[PDB]
From a paper:
We characterized the evolutionary trajectories and selection forces underlying emergence of β-propeller proteins, a globular and symmetric fold group with diverse functions. Propellers comprise four to eight blades arranged in radial symmetry, with each blade comprising a four-strand β sheet. Second, tachylectin-2 is an immunoprotein that agglutinates foreign cells by multivalent binding of surface GlcNAc- and GalNAc-decorated glycoproteins. The repeating motifs encode both the globular propeller fold and the rigid binding of saccharides between propeller blades.
To infer the ancestral motif from which tachylectin-2 may have diverged, we separated and aligned the five-sequence motifs of tachylectin-2 from T. tridentatus. Tachylectin-2 is a near-orphan protein, but we identified a sea anemone homolog which is 44% identical in sequence and essentially identical in structure and function. The aligned individual motifs were assembled in a phylogenetic tree and the common ancestral motif was inferred. The caveats associated with this inference are a limited number of sequences and unknown phylogeny (the species where the two lectins are found are not closely related). However, because of the high sequence identity and unambiguous alignment, the prediction seems comparatively robust (34 of 47 positions predicted with ≥90% probability).
Residue numbers in the entry: 13 to 249
Write the structure that this text describes.
């Protein structure tokens, strides 16, 4: 079993099985686990250990997945792990190992996540890429820890760079297609299905291959997805 988590523009948070049926209403099959205020975060992301991390008002938090909770109740109970600078991250996202990656000021960094706001995260983070990361439209991992990035509407994959001298984009593998920036959401499920959504949701089960995602044959939710601000799914540990 794995799940998609969706924040709507009404500030509700839903949990449900990934969509498979183009005519089905995915919301009908889903459970509301967050009641209100969930669209107020700048960032919301899963740790593969199953903890939810979130950035709201430039502060970073971690806590258990909510169980019919407002965003306010959740934040009040969460551990504060950062204060100042976090809202500016273009991307913040975990690898399958629970190592935090982040893009800020055009650069890519990784490090164990903070556990307190005294821990200046950038101060000891590993610089992976000195330039060009601020132009990506998406940047995310699969369950195997391959990195995926969209730039100039094209989707690239490759082992993540290990230091600033790895020319990642230069050595990466190119998907077919030049409309990958037209998705609002593009991510992997826990079980390695590639998901892309705008108003409609497209999903490719493994093997993913290198074909264009948004083919009529991969459509699993025809219409109605414009209601979600965020769709995420945890990677396994």
């Amino acid at each position: 079993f794995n799940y998609i988590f969706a924040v709507s523009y009404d500030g509700e948070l839903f949990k449900g099985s990934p969509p498979e049926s183009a005519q089905a209403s995915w919301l009908t099959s889903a459970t509301r686990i967050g009641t209100k205020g969930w669209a107020n975060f700048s960032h919301l992301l899963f740790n593969p250990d199953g903890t939810l991390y979130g950035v709201v008002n430039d502060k970073f938090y971690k806590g258990p997945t909510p169980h019919r909770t407002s965003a306010e109740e959740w934040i009040a109970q969460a551990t504060l792990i950062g204060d100042g600078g976090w809202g500016a991250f273009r991307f913040l996202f975990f690898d399958p190992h629970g190592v935090l990656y982040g893009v800020t000021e055009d650069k890519l960094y990784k490090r164990e996540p903070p556990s307190s706001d005294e821990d200046h995260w950038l101060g000891s983070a590993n610089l992976l890429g000195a330039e060009g990361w601020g132009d990506f439209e998406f940047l995310f991992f699969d369950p195997e820890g391959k990195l995926y990035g969209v730039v100039n509407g094209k989707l690239h994959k490759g082992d993540p760079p290990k230091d600033r001298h790895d020319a990642w984009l230069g050595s990466s593998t190119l998907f077919k297609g030049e409309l990958w920036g037209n998705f609002r959401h593009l991510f992997f499920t826990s079980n390695g299905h590639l998901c892309g959504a705008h108003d409609s949701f497209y999903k490719k089960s493994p093997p993913i291959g290198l074909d264009w995602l948004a083919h009529e044959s991969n459509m699993v939710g025809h219409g109605g997805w414009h209601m979600f601000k965020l769709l995420i799914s945890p990677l396994p540990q």
